[PDB]
Amino acid sequence: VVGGTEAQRNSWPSQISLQYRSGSSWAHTCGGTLIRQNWVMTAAHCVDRELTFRVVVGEHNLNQNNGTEQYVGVQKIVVHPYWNTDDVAAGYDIALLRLAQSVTLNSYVQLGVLPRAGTILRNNSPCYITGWGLTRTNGQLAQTLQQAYLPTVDYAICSSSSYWGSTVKNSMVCAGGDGVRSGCQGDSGGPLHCLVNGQYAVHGVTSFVSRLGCNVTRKPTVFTRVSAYISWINNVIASN
């Protein structure tokens, strides 16, 4: 998250840290959203590599014990059947992870609230992206969970020539693009929390940013639109 601020310890309990094993240590690679005690929603490109992944819930500072973390292995990885690694712009950048064991829910570990199927946000809707991603284009991961206010940019505006054009699809949510604030590598798979009817709901799964950089003016951060995959998500959980 570029241009973000440190999130309060208990502000986003559905946020998880997706890490991969590197030698005798673990490294954070992506964010995710706990949607079931034993299911995590994340981006498909996050689990493209043939790595050993673990999920960490109740996490705040990646380099020191917070006394609230729960570490659990990933038992099954269900990537959307239409996901294509060489085509993030096509969409379908979403995956569900079945945890080896159900995590305990508390003040720091809660199931993310998902929006009703088909729900689209009005232009300039209030949202916050959260994650441990780079704090600067080509920079380094944040030690503590960060958050950035990224108002949405409706499809009409986002799919225009001045913005993302046809690169952005209707199955995606755009947010930010003010040149200062945005998601960045490491935030991928994480949530875009948007305020609707007084309640925050995870409307997006961080997918991509401009190859020119993370915080690029008129190149808002693009997220997989969660409301387009409600049936897909229910189907997977109901058969796994």
Applying the rule CB under 5 A, the residues between 81 and 120 that interact with Ca ion are: none
**Least distance in Å: CB of 41 to Ca ion?**
22
Q: Is 45 a catalytic residue?
A: yes
Q: Consult the annotation and say whether 84 binds a ligand.
A: no
- Selected catalytic residue, list 14, 17, 93, 182: 93
Stretch that binds Ca ion, among 59-67, 126-134, 160-168, 196-204 (CB under 5 A): 59-67
Residue 172: closest CA among 186, 153, 187: 153
Name the CA dihedral angle for 26, 27, 29, 33, rounded to a multiple of 10 degrees. 50
Tokens found for residue 6: 């440190």
27 lies in the binding site for Ca ion (CB under 5 A): no
Distance CA 85, CA 191 (A): 20
**Least distance in Å: CB of 229 to Ca ion?**
30
**For Ca ion, the closer CB: 28 or 225:** 28
Residues in Cβ contact with 52 at an 8 Å cutoff, skipping those fewer than 6 apart:
20, 21
Q: Is 17 a catalytic residue?
A: no
**For Ca ion, the closer CB: 8 or 66:** 66
Residue 195: closest CA among 147, 163, 160, 230: 147
Stretch that binds Ca ion, among 61-69, 81-89, 156-164, 171-179 (CB under 5 A): 61-69
**Least distance in Å: CB of 108 to Ca ion?**
11
Q: Is 87 a catalytic residue?
A: no
Stretch that binds Ca ion, among 5-13, 21-29, 62-70, 142-150 (CB under 5 A): 62-70
Distance CA 187, CA 43 (A): 10
Contact 74, 98 (CB under 8 A): yes
Q: Consult the annotation and say whether 69 binds a ligand.
A: yes
Q: Consult the annotation and say whether 6 binds a ligand.
A: no
One of 5, 66, 140, 234 touching Ca ion (CB under 5 A): 66
Catalytically active residues, by annotation: 45, 93, 188
The residue ranges that bind Ca ion (CB under 5 A) are 61, 66
Residues annotated in the binding site for Ca(2+), as ranges? 59, 61, 64, 69
